[PDB]
Amino acid sequence: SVFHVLADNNPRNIEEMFDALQKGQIHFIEMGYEPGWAALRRLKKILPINEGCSRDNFKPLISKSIEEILSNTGKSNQLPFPSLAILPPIAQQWLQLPLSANDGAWIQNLPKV
Amino acid sequence: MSRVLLCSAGHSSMVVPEAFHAVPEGFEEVHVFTTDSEKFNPVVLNDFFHSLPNVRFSITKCHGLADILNERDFEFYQEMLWQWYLTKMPDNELPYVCLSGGIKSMSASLQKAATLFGAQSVFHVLADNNPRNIEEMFDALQKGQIHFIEMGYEPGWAALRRLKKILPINEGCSRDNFKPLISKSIEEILSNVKIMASDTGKSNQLPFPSLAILPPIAQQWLQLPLSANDGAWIQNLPKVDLHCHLGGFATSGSLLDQVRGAWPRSHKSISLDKYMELGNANGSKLLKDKGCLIRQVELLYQSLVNDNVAYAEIRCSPNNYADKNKNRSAWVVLQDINDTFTRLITEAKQKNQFYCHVNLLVIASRKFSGDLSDISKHLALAITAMQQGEGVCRIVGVDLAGFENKETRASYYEHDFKAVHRCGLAVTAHAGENDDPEGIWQAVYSLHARRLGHALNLLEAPDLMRTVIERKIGVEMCPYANYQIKGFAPMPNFSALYPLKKYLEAGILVSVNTDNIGISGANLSENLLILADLCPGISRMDVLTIIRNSIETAFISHDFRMELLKFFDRKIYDVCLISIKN
Amino acid sequence: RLITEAKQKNQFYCHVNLLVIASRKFSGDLSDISKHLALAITAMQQGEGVCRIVGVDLAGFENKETRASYYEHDFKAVHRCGLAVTAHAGENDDPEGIWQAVYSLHARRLGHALNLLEAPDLMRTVIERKIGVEMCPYANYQIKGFAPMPNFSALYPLKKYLEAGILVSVNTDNIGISGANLSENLLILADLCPGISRMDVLTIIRNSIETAFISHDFRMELLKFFDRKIYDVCLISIKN
Amino acid sequence: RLITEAKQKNQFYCHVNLLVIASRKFSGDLSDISKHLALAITAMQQGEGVCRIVGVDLAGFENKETRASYYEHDFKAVHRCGLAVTAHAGENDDPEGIWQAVYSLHARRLGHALNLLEAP
């Protein structure tokens, strides 16, 4: 859940915002539950803690995927398996990317005929 | 190209010119969303944009909300901002947007809108001195103090962006009688994703005609059996008519009267001779002249466009319309038909309006009495006609219609049909009235009929059913035609059950066709309607699968089939979204 | 027995069916072809079972002595009974033979058919009738040669086959001899056909489902299961 | 137009009719034979006019690999419709292909056939 906290007087001291919440001045604003993408976290396995690092080893892993989202008819409505429409857009454009050798894991997990 | 710009500004308004000058290439349309607070100063932006009249500009005001203070204020602001974003979006382009203006809540809501509906490039603007006048910001950008930050690139949900068709009929979202339909959109997407990810039995699949993003209430409505009151929805639904005869349109009425100048729900069985005589006022005796034929073509195309039919295949007899006395050969008649259809299609398409692509099928008329060379002449004419190449409207198939009795089965001219099969031309058979399973069998396997006509009695031949289902050859099942001629349940004296339901369960690619609109008096919409009482327990999902079978069975190239599938998917999604709310 | 014992424990089981190969001039007299067809139809006539006999196969050496336009009369009965035929009309076979296989044998599939790009009419009818074209990437690459093969100029035509609209399916032929199962067979497409997309691979799987000889209900269940599994795998794929 | 112009002035005019050559095209996407036959049939079916299409001709690549004993089944429509058939064969072919052309395609003319003297 992602949300926002708004205060009419913007309290500074803790007792002030405490008194504000006693009456109810602080309101709560959220735009709804965000499923995100069901599976993206193996970035933290493949990328270690990297406590010692700087701007030199900047990882643009997803940005080129984001760049190729729309920069690149058959590929548009060749969509099989109608439930792929429910699939979130980032992985859809990921599918729109060209095949690569490093997709062996997905190929093996892929149900085939 | 319309590089539309959307922004929101709070106490500071000069950021929008900064956004415009952030890209030196220059935008074309800029719109700003702002509340009705008195702290705004629109005059500076108004006079700045008046200095470049070539760039469109507009201001929209969110009435009634001076500032966001409680939950209702924020939800109303979010709904209004979403409505404005989705109403000012380019028709066929993702717009730009800058988030710098406005307070944090507007910024977050705008970014949420950009994520949901897509944007070419979301970006920011950074001012070192935070100017208040055009001159100071101009000096800053000349020096280099201007700073633009870009972080995102969002495609958005195409299904969400295809929702702007429901915007009207709301008067402008007045707080007294406002329903936040964009919140309905967000609950639809959230519910769909959550249901898909929280189950497997539901998450199997279901809709093969492709959609799967409708609200769950819409899917439940679709799964329910169709009633007789879905006429408006189904008329709004685009259809396909793969079997329609040109010569049986203006068989009676004012249409016949006006083409000469230049029922329809029966409950008694009618013989084929009476059905043919019903259209005796038109065709061979009338359409010999050019004017009547042209009027017939234009009237038929107008009716097809009126019925929202997006594609159709027309069977016409060029030899029956020829007139050697007036130097009107059959080839000339066919050329005239093709030319007028092409002209109508181009006229409809050039105005960017819905149009009905139409292809002709040359019917190899059955005579079996005299001048048996007429079949070979028809085949040669069809081959030469398809060899034209150019033209949006063309020849794609040959119809083996006529008296489908044993005297004219498919074991007669297969060696002749070798010629038509060689040139890559489709063949449509007709073996549906008073025929044996053997006849259907070698019509499928010797004539190589890529599509089959009628064949209502496949139920009693399981081997024939396996052959037709396995080979994926279609069936031209005509509801009203057999209703008038044969008749089925629940009409009196007609206790027979229509095999359309069982055909759908088996998996036969059944396509519902109108046959002759003029003679039957009922169009394709009524043809689909009659299934409500003809086949009890029929649901709208089966109607959508019928449309999918029709589009999947037609003799079209792969690319054209792809385009038609795209258009049909988009239109079906839009019409379902429109109809579910009302 | 294997399928039933795998399904009883509720695990992942590979439903499998058999194809009866009817070779040409492989053992001597050609009456062996009639014997093979009779055996295949009698076997399919079992009625009840799980792993059934979908149809027959037609395989030969190269051409001429193994042409596909010799045994139509023999094939009449077996093809009438309700089986299916997958003629090996390809691998340096002239387009006329492929035409005979499609239009006289009523073959629902064509083996390899690599050189189909030089017969525009044969192409047109193949796409117009959605005749499956089984292709083995590794096997054809090894026995014919395609770019980036050293000292080779020709390139694999799979990308153009998919763009045209042929119901192409990717297979393995002989796993042991070629030394590659389906996974690496599909993987090699990246360096065999450049520019191939992932949605194209999914459409290849869809076409493989489409051209298989199965009943309508079994096809529907297979499609539902495949779609759900495909959604799960692409959900957990962008993880890496 | 040329014939009518010559005839209007009452000069000497050469009546001209066209023969639709059905090129052999040894493989040549052999559907062109059916295309030519259909074109000739419909051209004759056009009917009205002074100059007219009278028949078809098959020739080209006269070697035995393209003899006249192949397309004897395609020539049923052209021959029932009303056209006339010509078969060029005999310059260096066997004395049996001529018999096939005469008694199968019903050819009313024999192109060349310079070796007829050796088959009484």
Ligand SMILES: Nc1ncnc2c1ncn2[C@@H]1O[C@H](COP(=O)(O)OP(=O)(O)OP(=O)(O)O)[C@@H](O)[C@H]1O
């Ligand atoms: N193959 C086609 N068949 C029919 N119409 C087509 C086809 N291709 C494009 N069109 C037309 O392209 C136009 C695109 O319209 P658009 O995407 O802007 O939706 P709209 O104008 O809001 O509503 P509508 O689709 O009814 O026009 C459609 O009107 C459609 O009639």
Ligand SMILES: [Mg+2]
């Ligand atoms: Mg009809």
Ligand SMILES: [Mg+2]
């Ligand atoms: Mg093999």
